[PDB]
mmCIF file of C-alpha atoms in Angstrom:
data_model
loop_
_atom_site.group_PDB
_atom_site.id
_atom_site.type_symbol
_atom_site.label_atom_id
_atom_site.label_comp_id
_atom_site.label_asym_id
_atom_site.label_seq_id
_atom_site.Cartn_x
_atom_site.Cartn_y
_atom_site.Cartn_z
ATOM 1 C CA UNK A 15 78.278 110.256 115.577
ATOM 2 C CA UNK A 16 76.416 107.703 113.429
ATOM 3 C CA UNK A 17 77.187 104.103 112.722
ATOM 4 C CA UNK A 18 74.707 102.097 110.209
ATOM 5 C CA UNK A 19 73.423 99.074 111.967
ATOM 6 C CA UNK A 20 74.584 95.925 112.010
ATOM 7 C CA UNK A 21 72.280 93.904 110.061
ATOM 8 C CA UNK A 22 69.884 90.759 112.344
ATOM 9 C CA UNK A 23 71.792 87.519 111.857
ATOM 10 C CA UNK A 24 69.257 85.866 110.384
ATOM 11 C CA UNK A 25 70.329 87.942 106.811
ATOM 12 C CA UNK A 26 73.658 86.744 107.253
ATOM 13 C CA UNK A 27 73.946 82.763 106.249
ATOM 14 C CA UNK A 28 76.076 80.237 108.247
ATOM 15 C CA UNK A 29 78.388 78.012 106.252
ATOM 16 C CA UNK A 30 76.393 74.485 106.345
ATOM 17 C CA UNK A 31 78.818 71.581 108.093
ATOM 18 C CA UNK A 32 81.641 73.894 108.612
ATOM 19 C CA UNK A 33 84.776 72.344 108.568
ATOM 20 C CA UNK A 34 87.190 73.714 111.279
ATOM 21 C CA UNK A 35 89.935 71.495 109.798
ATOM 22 C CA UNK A 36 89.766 72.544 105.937
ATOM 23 C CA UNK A 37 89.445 76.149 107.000
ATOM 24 C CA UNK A 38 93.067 76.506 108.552
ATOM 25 C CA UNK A 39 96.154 77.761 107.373
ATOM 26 C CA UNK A 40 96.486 81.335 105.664
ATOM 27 C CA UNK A 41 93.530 83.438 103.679
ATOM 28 C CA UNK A 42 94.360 86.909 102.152
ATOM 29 C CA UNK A 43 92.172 89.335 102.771
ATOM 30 C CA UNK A 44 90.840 90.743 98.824
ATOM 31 C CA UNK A 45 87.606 92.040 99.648
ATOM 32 C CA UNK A 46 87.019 93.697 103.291
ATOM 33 C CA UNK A 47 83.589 95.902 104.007
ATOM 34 C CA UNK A 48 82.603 96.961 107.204
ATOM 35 C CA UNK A 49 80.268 100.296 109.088
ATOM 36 C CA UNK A 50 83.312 101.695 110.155
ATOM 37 C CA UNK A 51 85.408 100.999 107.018
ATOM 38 C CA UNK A 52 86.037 103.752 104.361
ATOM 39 C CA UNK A 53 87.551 103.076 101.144
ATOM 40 C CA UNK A 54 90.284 105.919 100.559
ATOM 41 C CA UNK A 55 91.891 105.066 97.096
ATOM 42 C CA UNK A 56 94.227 108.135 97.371
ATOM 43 C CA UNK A 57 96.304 106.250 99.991
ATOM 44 C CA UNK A 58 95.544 103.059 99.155
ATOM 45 C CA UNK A 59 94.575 100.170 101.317
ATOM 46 C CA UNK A 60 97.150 97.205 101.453
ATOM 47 C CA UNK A 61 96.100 93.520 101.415
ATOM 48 C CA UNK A 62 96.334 91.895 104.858
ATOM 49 C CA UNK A 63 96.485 88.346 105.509
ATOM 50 C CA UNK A 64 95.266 86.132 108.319
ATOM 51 C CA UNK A 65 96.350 82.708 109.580
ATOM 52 C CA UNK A 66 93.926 80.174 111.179
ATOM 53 C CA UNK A 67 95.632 77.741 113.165
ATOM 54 C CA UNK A 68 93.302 75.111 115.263
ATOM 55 C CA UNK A 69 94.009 74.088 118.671
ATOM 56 C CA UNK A 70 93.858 70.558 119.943
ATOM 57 C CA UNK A 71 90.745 72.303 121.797
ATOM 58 C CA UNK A 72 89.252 72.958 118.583
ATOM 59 C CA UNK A 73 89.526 77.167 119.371
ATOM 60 C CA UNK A 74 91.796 78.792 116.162
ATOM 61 C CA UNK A 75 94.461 81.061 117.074
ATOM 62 C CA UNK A 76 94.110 83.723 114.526
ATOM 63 C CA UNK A 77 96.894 85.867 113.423
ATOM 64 C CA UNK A 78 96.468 89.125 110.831
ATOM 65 C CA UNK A 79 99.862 90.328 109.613
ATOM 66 C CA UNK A 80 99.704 93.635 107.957
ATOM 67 C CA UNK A 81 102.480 96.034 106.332
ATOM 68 C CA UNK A 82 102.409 99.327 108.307
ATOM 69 C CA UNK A 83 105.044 101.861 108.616
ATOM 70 C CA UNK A 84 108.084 99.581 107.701
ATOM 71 C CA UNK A 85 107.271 96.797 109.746
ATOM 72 C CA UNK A 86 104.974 94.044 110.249
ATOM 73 C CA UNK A 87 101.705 94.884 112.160
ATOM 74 C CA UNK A 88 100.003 91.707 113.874
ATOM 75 C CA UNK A 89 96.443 91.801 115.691
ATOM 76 C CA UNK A 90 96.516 87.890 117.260
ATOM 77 C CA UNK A 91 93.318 86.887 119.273
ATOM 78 C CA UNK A 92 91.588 83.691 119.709
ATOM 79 C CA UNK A 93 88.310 82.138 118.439
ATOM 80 C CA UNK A 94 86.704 79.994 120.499
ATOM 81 C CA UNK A 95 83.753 77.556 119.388
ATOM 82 C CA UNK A 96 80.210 79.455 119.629
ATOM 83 C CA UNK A 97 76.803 78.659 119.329
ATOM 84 C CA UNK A 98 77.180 76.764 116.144
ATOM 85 C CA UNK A 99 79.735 75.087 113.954
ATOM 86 C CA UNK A 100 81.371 77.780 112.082
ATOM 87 C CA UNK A 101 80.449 80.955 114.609
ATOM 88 C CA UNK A 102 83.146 81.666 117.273
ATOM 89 C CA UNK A 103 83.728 84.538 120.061
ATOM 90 C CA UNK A 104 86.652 86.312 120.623
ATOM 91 C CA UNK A 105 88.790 84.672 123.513
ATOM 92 C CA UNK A 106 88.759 86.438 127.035
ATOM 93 C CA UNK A 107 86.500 89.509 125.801
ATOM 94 C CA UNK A 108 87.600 90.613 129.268
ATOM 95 C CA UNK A 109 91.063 91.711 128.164
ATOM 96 C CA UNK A 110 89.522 94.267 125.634
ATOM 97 C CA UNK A 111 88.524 97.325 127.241
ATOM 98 C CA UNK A 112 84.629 98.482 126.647
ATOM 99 C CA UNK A 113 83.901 95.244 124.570
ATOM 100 C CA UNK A 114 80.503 93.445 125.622
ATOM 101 C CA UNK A 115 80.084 91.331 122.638
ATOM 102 C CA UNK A 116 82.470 89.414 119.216
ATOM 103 C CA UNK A 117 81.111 87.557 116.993
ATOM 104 C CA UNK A 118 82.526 85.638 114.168
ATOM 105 C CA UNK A 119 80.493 84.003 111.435
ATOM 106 C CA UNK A 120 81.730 81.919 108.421
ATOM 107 C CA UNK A 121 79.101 82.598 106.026
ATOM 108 C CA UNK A 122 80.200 80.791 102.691
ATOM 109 C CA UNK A 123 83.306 78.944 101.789
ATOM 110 C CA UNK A 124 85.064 76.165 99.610
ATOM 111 C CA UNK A 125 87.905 75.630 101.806
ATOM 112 C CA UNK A 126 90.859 75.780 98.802
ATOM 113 C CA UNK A 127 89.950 78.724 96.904
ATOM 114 C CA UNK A 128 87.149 81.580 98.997
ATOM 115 C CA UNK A 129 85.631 82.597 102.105
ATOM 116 C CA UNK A 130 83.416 84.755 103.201
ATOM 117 C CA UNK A 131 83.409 85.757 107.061
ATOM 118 C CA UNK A 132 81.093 87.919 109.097
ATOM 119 C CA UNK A 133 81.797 89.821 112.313
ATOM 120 C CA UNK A 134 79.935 91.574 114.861
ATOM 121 C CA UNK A 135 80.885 93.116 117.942
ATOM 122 C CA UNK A 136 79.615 95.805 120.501
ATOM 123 C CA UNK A 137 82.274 98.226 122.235
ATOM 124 C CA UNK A 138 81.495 101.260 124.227
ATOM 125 C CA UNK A 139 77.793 100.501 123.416
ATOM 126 C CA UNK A 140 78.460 100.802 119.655
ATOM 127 C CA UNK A 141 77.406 98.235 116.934
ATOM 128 C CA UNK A 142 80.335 97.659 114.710
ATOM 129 C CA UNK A 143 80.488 94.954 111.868
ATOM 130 C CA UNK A 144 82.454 94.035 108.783
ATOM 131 C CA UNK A 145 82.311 91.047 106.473
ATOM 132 C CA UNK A 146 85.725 90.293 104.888
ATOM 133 C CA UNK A 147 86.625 87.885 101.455
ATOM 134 C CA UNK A 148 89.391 85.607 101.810
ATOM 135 C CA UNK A 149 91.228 84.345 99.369
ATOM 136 C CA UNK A 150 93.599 81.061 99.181
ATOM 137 C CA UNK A 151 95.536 83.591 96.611
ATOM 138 C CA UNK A 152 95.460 87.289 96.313
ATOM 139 C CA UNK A 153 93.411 87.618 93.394
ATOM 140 C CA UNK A 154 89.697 86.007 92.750
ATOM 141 C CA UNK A 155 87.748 86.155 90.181
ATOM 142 C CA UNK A 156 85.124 89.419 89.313
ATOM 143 C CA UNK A 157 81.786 86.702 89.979
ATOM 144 C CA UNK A 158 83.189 86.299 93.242
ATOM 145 C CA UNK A 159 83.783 89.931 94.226
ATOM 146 C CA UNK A 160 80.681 91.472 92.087
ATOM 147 C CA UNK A 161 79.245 88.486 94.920
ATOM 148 C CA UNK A 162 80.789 90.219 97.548
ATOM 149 C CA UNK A 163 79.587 93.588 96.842
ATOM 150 C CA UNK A 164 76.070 92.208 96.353
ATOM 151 C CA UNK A 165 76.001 90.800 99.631
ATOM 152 C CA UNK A 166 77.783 93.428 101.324
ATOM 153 C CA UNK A 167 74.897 96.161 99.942
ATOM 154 C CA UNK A 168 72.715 93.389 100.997
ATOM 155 C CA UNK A 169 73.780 94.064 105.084
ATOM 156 C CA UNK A 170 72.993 97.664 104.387
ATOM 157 C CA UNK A 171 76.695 98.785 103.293
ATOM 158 C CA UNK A 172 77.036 101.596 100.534
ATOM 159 C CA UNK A 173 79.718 101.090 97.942
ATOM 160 C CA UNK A 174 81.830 103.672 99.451
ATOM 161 C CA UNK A 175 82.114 101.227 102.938
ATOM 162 C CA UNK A 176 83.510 98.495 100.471
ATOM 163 C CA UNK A 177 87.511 98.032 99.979
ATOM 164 C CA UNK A 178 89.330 95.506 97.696
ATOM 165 C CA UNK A 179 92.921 96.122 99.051
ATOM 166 C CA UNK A 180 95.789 96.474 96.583
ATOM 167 C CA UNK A 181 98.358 92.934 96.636
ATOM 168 C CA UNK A 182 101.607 93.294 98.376
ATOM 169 C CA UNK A 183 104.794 90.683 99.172
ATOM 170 C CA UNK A 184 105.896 92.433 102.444
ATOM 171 C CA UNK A 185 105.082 90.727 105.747
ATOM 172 C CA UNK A 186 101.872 88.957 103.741
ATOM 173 C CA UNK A 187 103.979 86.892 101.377
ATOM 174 C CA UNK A 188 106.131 84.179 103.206
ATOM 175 C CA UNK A 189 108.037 83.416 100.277
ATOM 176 C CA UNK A 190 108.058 86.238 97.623
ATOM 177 C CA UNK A 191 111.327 87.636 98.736
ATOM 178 C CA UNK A 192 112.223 91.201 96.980
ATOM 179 C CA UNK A 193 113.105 91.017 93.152
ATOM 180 C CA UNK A 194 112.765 92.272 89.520
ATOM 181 C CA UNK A 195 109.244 91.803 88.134
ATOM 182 C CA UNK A 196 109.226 88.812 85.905
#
């Protein structure tokens, strides 16, 4: 029925100088808000992660791993390079059914530690966004994520379209194995 709308990009900020080199490599997804995104604590969301790996081209192939069902879940896609250093589209747009428009927007980061990324995308002449807080590790600090929320509420988001999914080894965790909590 109704979708809130996505906010004008000129209230979402653009990572000065982004660097498409520090950025790579794996971010876990702790904080992850969206229009079509409800937080449901009574079957709690599960961290994702996502790998950025740059091309010699300078697109990222971009892989999400998630833990669903008793097996690992994967949405892979490209990003190639869009109107500005740190924005990207989603490579062939063609090959997704009903999708006129995906965009991707770094919006803050430190490279070792935090992100903050901002998407944007029309399908079936619907607005959908969602603006998601990496982490180099699965845990951040409360400034950080009290950060998120504030800018999140910021885009027009209610609390309730705000998730901070629970930590998890499987299919996320490369090298956590399965043992005895220490």
């Amino acid at each position: 029925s109704d979708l809130i709308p996505a906010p004008p990009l000129s209230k979402v900020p653009l990572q000065q100088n982004f660097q498409d080199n520090q950025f790579h490599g794996k971010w876990y997804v702790v904080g992850f808000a969206g229009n079509a995104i409800l937080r449901e604590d009574k079957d709690p969301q599960k961290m994702f992660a996502t790998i950025y790996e740059l091309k010699e081209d300078k697109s990222y192939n971009v892989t999400s791993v998630l833990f669903r069902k008793k097996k690992c879940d994967y949405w892979i896609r490209t990003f190639v390079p869009g109107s500005q250093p740190g924005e990207f589209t989603l490579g062939n747009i063609k090959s997704y059914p009903g999708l006129t428009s995906y965009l991707v927007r770094v919006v803050s980061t430190n490279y070792n530690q935090h992100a903050m990324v901002f998407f944007k995308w029309v399908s079936q002449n619907r607005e959908y966004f969602n603006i998601t807080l990496y982490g180099r590790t699965k845990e951040l600090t409360s400034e950080l994520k009290e950060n998120f929320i504030r800018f999140s509420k910021s885009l027009g988001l209610p609390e309730n379209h705000i998730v901070f999914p629970v930590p998890i080894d499987q299919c996320i965790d490369g090298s956590a194995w399965s043992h005895p909590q220490f």
